[PDB]
Write an enzyme that holds these catalytic residues in place. Structure first.
Site, PDB file in Angstrom:
ATOM      1  N   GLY A   1       0.801  -1.210   0.000  1.00  0.00           N
ATOM      2  CA  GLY A   1       0.000   0.000   0.000  1.00  0.00           C
ATOM      3  C   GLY A   1       0.838   1.265   0.000  1.00  0.00           C
ATOM      4  O   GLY A   1       0.403   2.301  -0.500  1.00  0.00           O
ATOM      5  N   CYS A   2       2.041   1.175   0.553  1.00  0.00           N
ATOM      6  CA  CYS A   2       2.942   2.323   0.622  1.00  0.00           C
ATOM      7  C   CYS A   2       3.288   2.850  -0.772  1.00  0.00           C
ATOM      8  O   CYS A   2       2.973   3.988  -1.102  1.00  0.00           O
ATOM      9  CB  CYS A   2       4.194   1.943   1.435  1.00  0.00           C
ATOM     10  N   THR A   3       3.909   2.013  -1.593  1.00  0.00           N
ATOM     11  CA  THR A   3       4.296   2.406  -2.946  1.00  0.00           C
ATOM     12  C   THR A   3       3.070   2.659  -3.829  1.00  0.00           C
ATOM     13  O   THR A   3       3.162   3.333  -4.853  1.00  0.00           O
ATOM     14  CB  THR A   3       5.211   1.346  -3.609  1.00  0.00           C
TER      15      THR A   3
END
Lengths: 158, 217
Positions: free
Chosen positions: B7-9
């Site tokens: 989810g970060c990238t």
């Protein structure tokens, strides 16, 4: 409270018993007198394919509470493993393992177990649970790989 | 096996075109389908450079068992409140969100930072000749393989929201529509959203057919 949690716990086992990822093991503790403790599971997660953890079967203890499923089931590795997101006590750290964070009562045990396997490959750099592993992983990926590789072979079903 | 998409990238910096498409897939779900906590589309308020890490066990003077709303953001609520307005949604994710994301300068120290796009600026194309919206770039071959311009994907994104909104309304309240690869509206939505997201990061745009094949995979 009690009862409610047990109703969901039985539901989890029913769902898991029907369908579950190949290689993953999960079953409640067999309480004496032919009974079963649904608030304590003995699960095992194998290393993900393509990772240095591949081949090793890591067992952990899933502890449940009466507040379940509102409260997240804290899982502790048995025994603890070399991972920056795993405390020396065995306590695994994960966003969906904390109610105030990303834990949702509708989360199935299957999602939790899969998340733990994923964490083995992609360690959370924001959570320095294991100082030793965190430091080694951050300054020497090579030395980290060695320890992880030996770990997989150490917990490899023989 | 397939590679997992963190989810970060996905929410932060998508260096791969396929990531922009995955982001759009979640966007659809978080607007007309299933609403998740971690798989959100809105910018995180608990960013390591904004609030906490957030490491195990919070660090605040409030009840941990009674969180206010630090990790329960629901973009679906805002979308439902606005009645799924193309302009509001467009100016949000493609104009305001990345603007707020720009606050995290620690993310742009080597990679070119994203450029916010306004609905009015895209309609009044200044980068290129603001010619006929119908058809300006003459190409040959598969029509679905023809990469459209930023204006096209902008209006296309707006049109898909229209058909999707009324589609959800036809199902009633409390309904959730699952994304598909055979639905023109759902496909147009993910195609336009992805193209817009990638365009903001100065990434080459892709055709609908190209995206359709990878969006559904």
């Amino acid at each position: 409270m009690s009862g409610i949690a047990l109703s969901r716990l039985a539901q989890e086992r029913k769902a898991w018993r029907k369908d579950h990822p190949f290689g993953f093991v999960a079953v409640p503790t067999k309480n004496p007198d032919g009974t079963m403790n649904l608030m304590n599971w003995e699960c095992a997660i194998p290393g993900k394919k393509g990772t240095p953890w591949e081949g090793g079967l890591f067992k952990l203890r899933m502890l449940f509470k009466d507040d379940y499923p509102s409260s997240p089931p804290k899982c502790k590795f048995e025994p603890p493993l070399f991972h920056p997101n795993v405390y020396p006590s065995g306590t695994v750290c994960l966003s969906i393992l904390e109610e105030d964070k990303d834990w949702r009562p509708a989360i199935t045990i299957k999602q939790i177990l899969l998340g733990i396997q994923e964490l083995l490959n992609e360690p959370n750099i924001q959570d320095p649970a294991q100082a030793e592993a965190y430091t080694i992983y951050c300054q020497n990926r090579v030395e980290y790989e060695k320890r992880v590789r030996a770990q997989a072979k150490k917990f490899a079903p023989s | 096996t397939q590679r997992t998409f963190p989810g970060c990238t996905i929410r932060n910096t998508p260096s791969e075109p396929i990531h922009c498409i995955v982001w759009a897939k979640y966007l659809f779900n978080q607007l007309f389908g299933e609403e998740d906590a971690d798989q959100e589309v809105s910018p995180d308020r608990a960013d390591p450079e904004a609030a906490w890490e957030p490491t195990e066990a919070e660090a605040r003077a409030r009840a941990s068992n009674e969180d206010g709303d630090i990790k329960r953001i629901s973009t679906k609520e805002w979308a439902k409140s606005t009645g799924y307005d193309p302009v509001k949604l467009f100016t949000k994710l493609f104009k305001d969100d990345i603007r707020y994301l720009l606050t995290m300068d620690k993310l742009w120290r080597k990679r070119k930072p994203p450029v916010p796009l306004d609905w009015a600026e895209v309609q009044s194309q200044g980068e290129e000749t603001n010619a006929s919206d119908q058809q300006n770039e003459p190409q040959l071959g598969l029509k679905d393989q023809q990469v459209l311009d930023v204006k096209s994907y902008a209006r296309l994104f707006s049109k898909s929201i229209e058909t999707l909104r009324v589609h959800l309304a036809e199902k009633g309240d409390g309904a959730e529509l699952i994304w598909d690869k055979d639905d023109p509206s759902a496909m147009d939505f993910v195609t336009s959203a992805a193209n817009l997201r990638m365009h903001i990061f100065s990434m080459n745009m892709k055709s609908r057919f190209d995206i359709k094949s990878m969006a559904g995979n």
